[PDB]
Every structure is written in C-alpha cells, then in structure tokens.
Design a protein around this nucleic acid. Structure first.
Ligand code: CA
Ligand code: CA
Ligand code: ZN
Ligand code: ZN
Ligand code: ZN
Ligand code: ZN
Lengths: 142, 142
DNA sequence: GAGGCTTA
DNA sequence: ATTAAGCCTC
DNA sequence: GAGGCTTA
DNA sequence: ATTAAGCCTC
C-alpha cells in the first residue's frame, strides 16, 4: 500500500506503473477514457467514482475476450502508440457504434481490442477470444 | 476475357478492378509487393513470372487462414490505407521476420493479415482463422 | 503506360 | 505492424 | 499536480 | 479503428 496523488486511494504496488508516471492505473485509464471520448466524439456516462469501482484492482482484471490476466498481458511487453510498455487492461466499447457507459464497457487487453476493432461484434469476438487464449496457453501464459 | 496492358495475359473480368485502374490484380499485387518490400527492407525472391503462377486466378483464391473467397472478401467493402475498396487477397509473410519468397508466402485476406500482424505465428493464426470463419459463416458469407 | 504515394 | 487501389505526374 | 499529446 | 503511459509545459 501507498497513496495515489490523484484519487488518494491506498493501493498496492500493482495498481501503479513501473516508469515515471505517479498516478494509479485507474486514474490514468480514466484520464485516457475522457480524453479519447472527447477526441473521438464518443459519449461518456461513467463518473470517475463509478468507473473506479468498475475497473476494480489489478490482480482481479482479465481480458473479457481471451482471459489473459493483467500481469500476463504486461509480460507480453506490448507498446502503446507512444510507444511505452502497456501495463494495464483497457475498456472495449463492446458495441463499437456506442460510447463509454457501464452497459457498453467491457474489459479487454489491447491485443483483443485492436483485433475486434470496429469489425467484429462482441459475440463474434468471444469466439476469436477463445482462439487467442490458446495462443497464450501455448506460450505458457495465464 | 480481355487483355492486361501490363502482363498482356488474357483474363476474365474478375481478374480486373472495378474502379479506374487498368492493370490486373496479379500485376497490381506484384507492384505493391515490390514497392512494399523495398520500403520495409524485406527481401524478395519471387520473380514476376513465379509470382503470377503462384497468385493464380481470382475464383481460386481463398484466405489461407479464414477460408474466405476473394469475392466474399470483396463483399465486405474493406478499405485499404488510401482508402479505396479492397478487391483481392494479399500475401502474408507467414514468418513475419522473413521476407517475400515462395516458401514464406501465404495467401491471406487483409483482415487476417492485420490481425496476425507480427504478433501471432502462422500456426497460432490457423486457430484464429477458424474463429474468423465462424464470423463469416454466421454473416452468410463464403 | 510506368512511379510514387499514405497508412483502419 | 500489417499492407493495397486509385490518382496525378511523368 | 493537471493537460495535451501521437498513433503497431 | 482500436486506444494508452510517459514527457514536457504549465
Ligand atoms: Ca473496442
Ligand atoms: Ca503478414
Ligand atoms: Zn488514482
Ligand atoms: Zn485479450
Ligand atoms: Zn496483368
Ligand atoms: Zn482471412
């Protein structure tokens, strides 16, 4: 446990980043969500408080398509567009025509999220997800 | 049958594009392959002649991952980066660390090709491909 | 008729 | 990261 | 400590 | 098209 200078929550080391950012993963994902929604013209019905309760804690997070844990995904050393090492799971607007909301949000790893893109429906992606999980299972990753 | 001003082959309408380009799909895919290989620093052991025999004809082409026919893929109205309507299947460098060669080339639709990216091996992608095929099968597409 | 491009 | 068809000179 | 970014 | 963590002002 230490304290996030932003939400002031008391959190385990696994809720924080490994590089030089000081805010927690929930705070950072919330700042990204709001900036992305504005830029992309998506609606956002989450408040920070509902989002943070929705996002939960690092050891409980798994991609809702492939099942990979947040630590497992971290171990793949994927890079974001900037491109720094990706260390948390993000949110998929499961209906890609709708915005951010509790009803429309689904936790997804950045690999599944980009695969799904705006091409596959969430149920089509559930089936892709199972195939992706076999890749991970084969690589010795959970 | 009409004649491609480039390879001078006598070809069915389905070997040609629907927009304003005059060269056949084989010729265009060959010009793309050579330009992309140069730009990306990939080797290319195909000659035009071996490539054209490898690429075959439109009605015989199916993605080697998801099984979608070239006409089926055309019916999805995907756009290339330019972005015009995609009307043929391309080649996947199945080992993404190696270049273009008969041994390393595999026919793939642009959807499977981008999914695979440099993330999945060809055998991991075979399993993703089967899941993608179910999406198509469900959409009434072959 | 060929060349060089821009990037979901 | 993976490519792909029409445009706009030459 | 918060803001605005660039894009496999 | 889909997003995501560190940098560099403020
Ligand atoms: Ca999504
Ligand atoms: Ca490929
Ligand atoms: Zn926080
Ligand atoms: Zn996933
Ligand atoms: Zn030709
Ligand atoms: Zn395919």
């Amino acid at each position: 446990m230490t304290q996030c200078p932003r939400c002031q929550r008391n959190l385990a080391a696994d809720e924080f980043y490994a590089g030089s950012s000081k805010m927690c993963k929930g705070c950072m994902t919330w700042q990204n969500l709001s900036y992305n929604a504005n830029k992309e013209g998506h609606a956002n019905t989450f408040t920070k408080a509902t989002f943070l309760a929705w996002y939960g804690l690092s050891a409980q997070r798994h991609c809702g398509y492939c099942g990979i844990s947040e630590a497992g995904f971290t171990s793949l050393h994927r890079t974001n567009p900037r491109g720094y090492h990706i260390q948390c799971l993000g949110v998929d607007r499961s209906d890609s025509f709708e915005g951010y909301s509790p009803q429309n949000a689904r936790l997804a790893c950045f690999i599944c999220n980009r695969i799904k893109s705006n091409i596959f429906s969430a149920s089509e992606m559930d089936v892709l997800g199972e195939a992706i999980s076999k890749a991970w299972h084969g690589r010795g990753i959970a």
